[PDB]
Amino acid sequence: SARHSRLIILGSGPAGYSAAVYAARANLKPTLIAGQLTTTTEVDNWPGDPEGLTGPALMDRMQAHAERFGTELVYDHINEVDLNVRPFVLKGDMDEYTCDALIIATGATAQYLGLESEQKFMGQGVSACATCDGFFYKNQNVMVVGGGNTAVEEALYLSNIAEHVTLVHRRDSLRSEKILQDHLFAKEKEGKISIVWNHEVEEVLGDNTGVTGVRLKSTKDDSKQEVQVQGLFIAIGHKPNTSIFEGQLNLRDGYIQVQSGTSGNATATSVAGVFAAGDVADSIYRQAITSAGSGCMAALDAEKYLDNLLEHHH
Amino acid sequence: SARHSRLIILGSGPAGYSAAVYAARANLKPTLIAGQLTTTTEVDNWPGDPEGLTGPALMDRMQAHAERFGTELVYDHINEVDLNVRPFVLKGDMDEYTCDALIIATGATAQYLGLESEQKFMGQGVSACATCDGFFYKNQNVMVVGGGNTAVEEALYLSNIAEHVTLVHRRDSLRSEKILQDHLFAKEKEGKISIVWNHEVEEVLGDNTGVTGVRLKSTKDDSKQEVQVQGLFIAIGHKPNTSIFEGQLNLRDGYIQVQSGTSGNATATSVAGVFAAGDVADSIYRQAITSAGSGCMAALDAEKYLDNLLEHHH
Numbered sequence: 001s002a003r004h005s006r007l008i009i010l011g012s013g014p015a016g017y018s019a020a021v022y023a024a025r026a027n028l029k030p031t032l033i034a035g036q037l038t039t040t041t042e043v044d045n046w047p048g049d050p051e052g053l054t055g056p057a058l059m060d061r062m063q064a065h066a067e068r069f070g071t072e073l074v075y076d077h078i079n080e081v082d083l084n085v086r087p088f089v090l091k092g093d094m095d096e097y098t099c100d101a102l103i104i105a106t107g108a109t110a111q112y113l114g115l116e117s118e119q120k121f122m123g124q125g126v127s128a129c130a131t132c133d134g135f136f137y138k139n140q141n142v143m144v145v146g147g148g149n150t151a152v153e154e155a156l157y158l159s160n161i162a163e164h165v166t167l168v169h170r171r172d173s174l175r176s177e178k179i180l181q182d183h184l185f186a187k188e189k190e191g192k193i194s195i196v197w198n199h200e201v202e203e204v205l206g207d208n209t210g211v212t213g214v215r216l217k218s219t220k221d222d223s224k225q226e227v228q229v230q231g232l233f234i235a236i237g238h239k240p241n242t243s244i245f246e247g248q249l250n251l252r253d254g255y256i257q258v259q260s261g262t263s264g265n266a267t268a269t270s271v272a273g274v275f276a277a278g279d280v281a282d283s284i285y286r287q288a289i290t291s292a293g294s295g296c297m298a299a300l301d302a303e304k305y306l307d308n309l310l311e312h313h314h
Numbered sequence: 315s316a317r318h319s320r321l322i323i324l325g326s327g328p329a330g331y332s333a334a335v336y337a338a339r340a341n342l343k344p345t346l347i348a349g350q351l352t353t354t355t356e357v358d359n360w361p362g363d364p365e366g367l368t369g370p371a372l373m374d375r376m377q378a379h380a381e382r383f384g385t386e387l388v389y390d391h392i393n394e395v396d397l398n399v400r401p402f403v404l405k406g407d408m409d410e411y412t413c414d415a416l417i418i419a420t421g422a423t424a425q426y427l428g429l430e431s432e433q434k435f436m437g438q439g440v441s442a443c444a445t446c447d448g449f450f451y452k453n454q455n456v457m458v459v460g461g462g463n464t465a466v467e468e469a470l471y472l473s474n475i476a477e478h479v480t481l482v483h484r485r486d487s488l489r490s491e492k493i494l495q496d497h498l499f500a501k502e503k504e505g506k507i508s509i510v511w512n513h514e515v516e517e518v519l520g521d522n523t524g525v526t527g528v529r530l531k532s533t534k535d536d537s538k539q540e541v542q543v544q545g546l547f548i549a550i551g552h553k554p555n556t557s558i559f560e561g562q563l564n565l566r567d568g569y570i571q572v573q574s575g576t577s578g579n580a581t582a583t584s585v586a587g588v589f590a591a592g593d594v595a596d597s598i599y600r601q602a603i604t605s606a607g608s609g610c611m612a613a614l615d616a617e618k619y620l621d622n623l624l625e626h627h628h
Contacts, residue, residue: 018361018603025359025449027475045339047332047606048360048375050382061362068364069449131614135339135383160621161341186625260575264598284578285611289332292361293607297599300445307474311500 001096004087005031007302008099010078011241012063013037014288015278016105018295019302020066023103026303031072033090033097036107036279037288040132041123046288058288083248083271100309101273101302104256105295106241108279108286112234113145117204125211126204126232130154131287134161137231143168143214145201146235152176152184154235155193165193166227170219172197199225204232240280249274256281267298273309275301315410318401319345321616322413324392325555326377327351328602329592330419332609333616334380337417340617345386347404347411350421350593351602354446355437360602372602397562397585414623415587415616418570419609420555422593422600426548427459431518439525440518440546444468445601448475451545457482457528459515460549466490466498468549469507479507480541484533486511513539518546554594563588570595581612587623589615 007023009016012034023030037043040055049058067073076092087098110128112118118126127133130144134157142162144155147169155167167184174181187193198219205213211232216225240254250257250270258281259268267275277298278291321337323330326348337344351357354369363372381387390406401412424442426432432440441447444458448471456476458469461483469481481498488495501507512533519527525546530539554568564571564584572595573582581589591612592605 014361021359021361022445025445026471027449027452044383045335045610046362047328047335047379047610048372050375050379058362061364065361065364069358131336131339135341138341156621157340157617160617183622183625255576258576260580262569262572262574262595262597266574266598281576283576284580285614287610289603289610290607293604296359296361296601296603300599303471303474307470308497311497 002089002098003095004098005029005072006099006306007031007101007103008033008090008097009103009105010090011035011105011107011278011280012059013105013107013278014062014291015107015295015298016103017059017062017066018292019103019105019277019299020071021069022296022299023302024066024069024071026299028303028306029070029072031074031097031099032066033074033076033078033092035075035077036110036129036286040129043132043288044135045132078244081244081248083245083274086273088274101306102275103295103298103302104245104269104274104276104280105278105298106280108238108240110234110238111236113201113236115201115204118201118234121204121206121211121232125206125230126234128234130157130233130235133231133233134158137162139163140230141228142166142231142233143227143229144233144235145169146237147171147174147176148237149176149180150237151235152180154233156180156183156187158233159187159192162231166196166229167193168196168199168201168216170198170200196225238279238286242280253283255283265301267294267301273305316403316412317409318412319343319386320413320620321345321415321417322347322404322411323417323419324404325349325419325421325592325594326373327419327421327592328376328605329421329609329612330417331373331376331380332606333417333419333591333613334385335383336610336613337616338380338383338385340613342617342620343384343386345388345411345413346380347388347390347392347406349389349391350424350443350600354443357446357602358449359446392558395558395562397559397588400587402588415620416589417609417612417616418559418583418588418590418594419592419612420594422552422554424548424552425550427515427550429515429518432515432548435518435520435525435546439520439544440548442548444471444547444549447545447547448472451476453477454544455542456480456545456547457541457543458547458549459483460551461485461488461490462551463490463494464551465549466494468547470494470497470501472547473501473506476545480510480543481507482510482513482515482530484512484514510539552593552600556594567597569597579615581608581615587619
C-alpha cells in the first residue's frame with residue numbers, strides 16, 4: 001500500500017531543504033524524497049559564509065537542519081506521477097507515495113562537454129556558473145563555450161570582471177535573443193570580447209595552477225587553435241528537471257509556470273495543491289540563495305492550502 | 315560636493331547585505347548606506363544553521379561578507395531623496411550622495427506595546443514573529459495581541475503548533491480580511507482559539523522560566539483578567555520604512571510596488587534605475603531568507619540596467 005503524507009517535497013537542494021525547514025517548524029511533518037550547488041567546489045556567495053564554504057558542506061548543513069525539526073527523508077527515485085487525482089500519486093522504485101500537497105524542487109541540470117580534460121580540471125578552472133566563479137578571474141582572461149541565451153549572458157557578465165572574454169561556438173550564428181546579441185557585438189567592437197565561430201573544444205590544458213589554455217578544433221576543416229585562458233566556463237545549456245510532469249502541469253520551455261506576484265501564493269502551479277520552487281521554475285537568477293528563498297515561499301503557500309483543505313474535512 | 319557611486323544600496327539587513335555581496339562579486343564596487351532580524355534572540359530558520367545562531371551573529375557575518383569583496387560601507391541617515399533627476403540624490407546628515415542605480419532595502423518596523431514588562435521579557439517569551447518563534451511552544455498555550463491581518467494570520471499559523479491560542483484585541487471587531495476572519499471563527503468553534511474582545515495588555519508576567527502569564531485590562535470598564543501563557547506574540551502591525559519615498563515611487567499600502575514575475579527585472583520599481591528588495595516590498599513572507607533572495611535578485615537587475623546604460627555613454 002502507498003505511504004501517505006500530508007506534504008511531500010520532491011528534491012534535495014537549497015529549495016527543497018529550505019521548504020523542509022519551514023514546513024517542519026510549522027508542525028507539518030513533511031516528507032522529503034531526495035534521490036548545481038553540490039558540484040561547485042568553493043561557494044563564495046552564500047550570504048553570511050564569507051570564507052571556507054564548499055558545495056557539499058552547505059548541503060550537509062541544510063540536510064541536518066531539515067532533519068533536526070522532524071523532516072522524514074526518503075531515498076528513492078520517482079519515475080512517474082499522477083497529478084490528475086488527489087491525493088497525488090508518486091511512483092518510485094522502492095515504494096509508492098501519496099500526498100495532499102506537493103512541492104516540486106527538482107532543480108535543473110547543466111550540460112557539459114563530456115571531455116576527460118574538462119572533468120580533470122573541473123573545479124580547478126573549469127566551471128559551469130559565471131555568477132559563482134567569475135570573480136576569481138578579475139583582470140584575467142577567460143573563455144565561454146556555447147551559443148544560446150545562457151552563453152551570451154555569461155560572456156556579458158564576465159566582460160565587467162575579466163580583462164578579456166573569448167566566446168566560442170560550433171555554428172556560425174547565435175540562437176540567442178536579439179537584444180542580447182546587440183550588447184555582445186557592442187562589447188566586441190570595443191575589444192572586450194572576441195567571438196570564434198565554427199569551433200569546438202578539443203582539449204583543456206593546464207597543470208598544478210589549474211587551467212592555462214584550451215585547444216580548439218574547427219568544425220569546418222582540420223585546423224586547430226590554442227587560446228591562453230585561466231578560466232573556462234561551459235554554458236551549453238540548462239535543462240529543468242521536469243520530464244515526468246510533461247502533459248500534467250503548464251510548462252514554458254520546460255520550466256514549471258508559477259503564479260509569482262506580490263500578493264502571495266507566488267509558488268502555485270496550474271494544479272491546485274502543487275507548488276514549485278527553485279531552478280525548476282526560475283530561468284533568470286538560478287542561485288542557491290534565490291532557490292532557498294522560493295522554497296521558504298512554497299512552504300508557506302502549502303501551509304495555507306493544507307490548512308484551508310483541513311477546515312472542510314471530517 | 316556630492317559623493318557619487320555607480321550603485322548605492324540603502325539599508326543594512328538580509329536584503330541589503332545580500333545585494334552587496336552579489337554586486338561586489340560582479341565588480342560593481344557598491345556603496346551601502348547602513349544608518350527585524352537583529353531583535354530575534356535565537357534564529358532557528360536560516361537554512362544551513364541548524365543550531366546556535368543569533369540575530370546579531372548573522373548580521374555580523376553578512377556584514378563581513380559584503381566587506382570582504384569590496385563593499386564601501388557608510389554610516390549615515392538619509393532624511394530626503396530626489397528620484398526625479400539622475401543621478402539620483404540622497405541627502406544625509408553627514409554627506410550628500412548620488413548614484414546611477416539605487417537598491418532600496420530599508421526593511422519594515424514592527425510596532426510593540428511599549429511596556430516595561432514587555433521589554434523585560436523580550437526574547438524570554440515575548441516575540442513579534444510567530445514564524446520565527448512559534449515552534450518553541452508546540453503543545454503549549456500562547457497569546458496573540460492585535461486586530462488586523464497580521465494578528466489573524468499569526469493566530470492561524472500558531473493554531474497548528476500550540477495547544478491553544480488566545481487572540482486579544484482592544485476593539486470588539488476585526489479590521490482584517492473576510493476570508494481570514496472565516497478561518498479564525500472556524501477554529502474558535504472547535505476550541506482551538508479563544509478571542510477576548512475589548513481588552514489590552516496591562517502587564518507581562520513571569521520569572522526565570524520567562525513568560526508565565528499576562529494580565530489584561532478591559533477597555534470598557536475597570537475589570538482585569540489573568541491568562542496563563544508561555545508565549546506572547548505582539549502583532550499590532552508592520553510599517554514598511556518608506557516615508558521618504560512617498561510621492562516619488564508607486565506604493566501600495568506603504569509597500570514599494572515591484573514588477574515581480576518570472577521573466578526577470580522582478581525587483582524593478584516605477585522609476586527606471588530604482589530597485590526594491592526585502593520587507594520594504596514584501597507584505598506576505600517577510601523572512602530573512604526570502605529577503606536575502608530578493609537582494610540577490612536586485613543586484614542582478616541593477617547589474618543589467620547599469621551595463622546597458624554604460625553601453626551608450628561617452
